[PDB]
Amino acid sequence: FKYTRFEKARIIGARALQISMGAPVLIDVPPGITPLEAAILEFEKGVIPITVIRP
């Protein structure tokens, strides 16, 4: 399963939005990291709870 650019962007955006509203980070992040960078770190590690559905 290979994510497209748009699927990756949507997943990272949704994860960052969730993190900004108190959803706990699934990994360890450096202090001072912005929520978007935390979501990008989460995606790069590979721990992605959001799943895309296709027709």
């Binding site: 650019r5 748009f6 990756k8 962007a9 990272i12 955006g13 949704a14 960052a16 939005l17 993190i19 900004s20 509203m21 108190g22 706990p24 980070v25 992040v29 450096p30 202090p31 001072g32 990291i33 912005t34 929520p35 978007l36 960078e37 935390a38 979501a39 990008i40 296709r54 027709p55």
Partner: protein, 900 residues
């Protein structure tokens, strides 16, 4: 919360307007003397309030919070809606006068209903069928359902319906159709007949086109401002409504009192004109309603249509918050995906960051700093939604009360993502996402390699900076729009982000034959480029004093991937025999002995082997706006981060080379020896003699026309051909004599800047000037200037400038060159306007087309446009210069990977 799923458009019924209204307006006044709105006027508080301090009688909300409410004007006599005028005329001439049926046969009715049910998806077929039905009904004279003559109906410009009847035996008269009888005719139309006329039985009714109740737009939809002079400036809609109310009151008074029919008709026509100009002031064949000053009023139609109208001016494009604009300046020392932001803009624009577990300390520090210090914040928003501006006597308390879940609008800091845009916006690379880097001075900074996508040239250019505010928008920008991507153009599948002028020229000065560098220079350039290195490679030569020297090719190879291998001929190939020898050596085994290649090394044949540059010089072919072989291979075989790293390093390296090695252009760059000057002089002399011979032959009738054109055109074409060939030969002589050690030549042969034509015009003759492809002819009769004999067709007399820029132009040649420059400058603006219009049309036609998950391209209603995008499924951005896959490149790469 809900989202709009669809919008059904219809015609409002009079009962709908009556019920939706909050007031019936009777008084044609706006405000009283004291300044309060007149009850019953256009500004009645039951339609909403706009003046601060007032209160709405329908909502109870203050100004700016009350949405606005509708009112109605019960018209004394019904009027005709101008928008539906032609529709009413078509319906009138397609339906019976007495019963109202469509005047079509029952068999025709059922057949056309069946054909209406079919072919409804597309508008064009339905419209054509409607026109056919309209023609068939219009031609008919007698209603088939009920025997009755159907007098033909004539229609002048708006709201004038005039059917013609036979008043007397053999004499016919035209009878004007008042809105009352027209509306009654429309009400008599049955519901089963509407679909064949195109009308919807429920969402529309033909009778509702004749409007007897006029809705009044809310106060908030037509605000009035008080001028600094103390007078009140009303909207155009307000004035038009006031006039409509006044005329309606006059008509009602004359109707209830009783007046002669002519005066009543005149007042009715006045009211109809007022309503028509209210709906559409620029309707065909109507005198526009002019303001007291003298300008025409802007009404509903003008509110909607136009480039300044509602749709284009406030819906498709609209002004936005959190944006900045200033002049851009170059900055080679920031990465390609970065932008230098002034401290003023960073302090002004803010990024809303919700405080979390990890950024609590940083947000506390920036709240403590406040709006004054740069790493600070402006506002703090509690979870309840109440916002507090940070100021003195607030910073300590707000920092204490930061907690978790609050919002802090902090200043821009390094790493933030923004949108950067220079907005003549032609392609999608006009907006890319850049990483913020805060800078002292008040100008935007941009890496030089990113200029070609923006078409920016640092001559006063300004670019807009937009700060995304939501985390979803920030992620979208940072993932889809960053400058690391979009290196390859979707237009041609080639590199658009590359070296432009100084990178190319410095690369040539680096990698050319005989270019060597000292140890200090090598270490300094490697540190400047950002290349990480702990040991220099073994030197190539040794100076007369024993000093080690490095070749430029080794330094360039220090920043190439260790697996890369490619060969190609660049623009510096002047002797193809050496290139052929190198290719013959390579083709025998594909892994030639490096020393054997070094024996036959040539500047016009670039040959990289295992990341080591063994032959060739850096050119526009290595990296550039088009046809960057090395950059394309690095971005297609190693990723997009490696391409960015290589681009940054090579740009900095070439900049250092060109800066510390010296690159200049002087007067001597256009000098030619006496032999070259004599050869050019003989070239022009022979060209002029040939033109004279052609003119003499044409004067004696000796010349005969070329096929496809007359004698005059034949002579003109021959003369232009001779002049162009003479210019080409003189340019060839200049190219032969100037040489490759000239800096002006260096930047032209390497594609850094300028063509051979510029050098030809600067060191040799300027050549023939022309407008619209013809010789210069506009001026006096038989000549261009009064300094030439009339009827002269010679070379000099028609625009052939025989001087170089260095040699200086004569006044005649100066005027001719001015004409040429003027034609070019005139061409530019016309071309850009036409191209802009064509691009707008193409975009509005192809906006929504997209690739589905099955690989096809489909229209919004589901129509399949392409069963496989590009007929093979390959995106042009990801393609190899338009090819699906570079087969030979893959074969060579794999064979070298395994056999190597």
């Amino acid at each position: 919360k809900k989202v709009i799923g669809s919008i059904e458009f219809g015609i409002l019924s009079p009962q709908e307007i009556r019920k939706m209204s909050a007031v019936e307006v009777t008084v044609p006044d706006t405000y009283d003397d004291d300044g309060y709105p007149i009850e019953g006027g256009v500004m009645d508080k039951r339609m909403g309030v706009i003046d601060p301090g007032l209160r709405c009688e329908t909502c109870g909300g203050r100004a700016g919070e009350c949405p606005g409410h509708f009112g109605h004007i019960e018209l004394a006599r019904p009027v005709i809606h101008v928008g539906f005028a032609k529709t009413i005329y078509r319906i009138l001439e397609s339906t019976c006068r007495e019963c109202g049926r469509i005047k079509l046969t029952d068999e025709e009715i059922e057949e056309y209903m069946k054909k209406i049910e079919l072919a409804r998806n597309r508008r064009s077929e339905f419209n054509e069928i409607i026109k056919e039905i309209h023609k068939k009904a219009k031609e008919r004279m007698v209603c088939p359902h009920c025997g009755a003559p159907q007098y033909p109906i004539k229609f002048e410009k708006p709201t004038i319906y005039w059917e013609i009847r036979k008043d007397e035996q053999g004499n016919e008269y035209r009878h004007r159709l008042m809105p009352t009888e027209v509306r009654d005719w429309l009400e008599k139309i049955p519901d089963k007949d509407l679909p064949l006329l195109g009308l919807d039985p429920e969402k529309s009714r033909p009778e509702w086109m004749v409007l007897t109740v006029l809705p009044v737009p809310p106060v908030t939809a037509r605000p009035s401002i008080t001028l600094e002079t103390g007078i009140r400036a009303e909207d155009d809609l307000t004035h038009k409504l006031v006039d409509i109310i006044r005329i309606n009151n006059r008509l009602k008074q004359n109707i209830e009192a009783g007046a002669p029919q002519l005066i009543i008709e005149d007042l009715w026509d006045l009211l109809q004109y007022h309503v028509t100009t209210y709906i559409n002031n620029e309707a065909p064949g109507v005198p526009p309603a002019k303001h007291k000053s003298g300008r025409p009023l802007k009404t509903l139609a003008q509110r909607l249509k136009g480039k300044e109208g509602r749709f284009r001016g406030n819906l498709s494009g609209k002004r936005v918050n959190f944006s900045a604009r200033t002049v851009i300046s170059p900055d080679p020392m920031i990465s390609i995906n970065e932008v230098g932001v002034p401290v003023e803009v960073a302090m002004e624009l803010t990024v809303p960051e919700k405080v979390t577990e990890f950024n609590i300390e940083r947000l506390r520090k920036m709240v403590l700093n406040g709006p004054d210090k740069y790493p600070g914040a402006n506002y703090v928003i509690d979870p309840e939604g109440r916002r507090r501006r940070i100021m003195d006597s607030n910073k300590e308390t707000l920092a204490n009360q930061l907690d978790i879940g609050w919002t802090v609008e902090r200043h821009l800091m390094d790493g933030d993502i923004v949108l950067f845009n220079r907005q003549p916006s032609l392609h999608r690379m006009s907006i890319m996402a850049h990483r913020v880097r805060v800078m002292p001075y008040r100008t935007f900074r941009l890496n030089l390699a990113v200029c070609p996508p923006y078409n920016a040239d640092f001559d006063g250019d300004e670019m807009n900076l937009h700060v995304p505010q939501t985390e979803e928008a920030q992620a979208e920008a940072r993932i889809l729009m960053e400058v690391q991507n979009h290196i390859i153009s979707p237009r041609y599948g080639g590199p658009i982000i590359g070296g432009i002028q100084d990178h190319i020229s410095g690369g040539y000065l680096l990698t050319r034959e005989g270019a060597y560098f000292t140890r200090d220079e090598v270490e300094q350039m490697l540190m400047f480029a950002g290349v990480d290195i702990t040991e220099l490679p073994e030197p190539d030569k040794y100076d007369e004093n024993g000093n080690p020297l490095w070749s430029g090719k080794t330094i360039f190879s220090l920043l190439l991937p260790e697996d890369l291998t490619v060969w190609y001929r660049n623009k510096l190939c002047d002797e193809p025999e050496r290139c052929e020898a190198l290719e013959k050596l390579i083709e025998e085994k594909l892994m030639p002995d490096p020393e054997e290649v070094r024996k036959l090394a040539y500047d016009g044949f670039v040959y990289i082997q295992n990341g080591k540059l063994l032959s060739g010089a850096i050119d526009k072919k290595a990296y550039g706006r088009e046809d960057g072989i090395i950059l394309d291979l690095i971005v297609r075989e190693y990723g997009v981060e490696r391409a960015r790293q290589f681009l940054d390093q090579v740009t900095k390296l070439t900049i250092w080379v060109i800066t510390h090695k010296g690159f200049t252009t002087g007067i001597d760059d256009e000098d030619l020896p006496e032999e070259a000057r004599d050869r050019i002089r003989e070239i022009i002399r022979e060209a002029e003699e040939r033109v004279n011979k052609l003119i003499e032959a044409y004067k004696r009738g000796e010349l005969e026309p070329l096929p496809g054109k007359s004698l005059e055109d034949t002579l003109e074409s021959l003369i232009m051909a001779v002049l162009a060939e003479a210019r080409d030969n003189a340019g060839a002589v200049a190219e032969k004599y100037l040489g490759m050690d000239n800096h002006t030549v260096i930047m032209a042969k390497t594609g850094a800047r300028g063509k051979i034509l510029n050098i030809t015009q600067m060191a040799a003759l300027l050549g023939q000037q022309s407008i619209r492809g013809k010789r210069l002819y506009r001026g006096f009769r038989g000549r261009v200037l009064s300094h030439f004999k009339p009827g002269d067709l010679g070379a000099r007399a028609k625009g052939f400038v025989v001087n170089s820029y260095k040699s200086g132009l004569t006044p005649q040649e100066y005027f001719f060159h001015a004409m040429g420059g003027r034609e070019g400058l005139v061409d530019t603006a016309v071309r850009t306007a036409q191209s802009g219009y064509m691009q707008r049309r193409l975009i509005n036609a192809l906006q929504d087309l997209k690739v589905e998950y099955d690989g096809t391209v489909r229209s919004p209603e589901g129509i399949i446009v392409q069963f496989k995008y590009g007929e093979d499924g390959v995106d042009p951005m990801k393609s190899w210069r338009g090819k699906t896959v570079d087969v030979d490149r893959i074969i060579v790469r794999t064979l070298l990977k395994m056999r190597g």
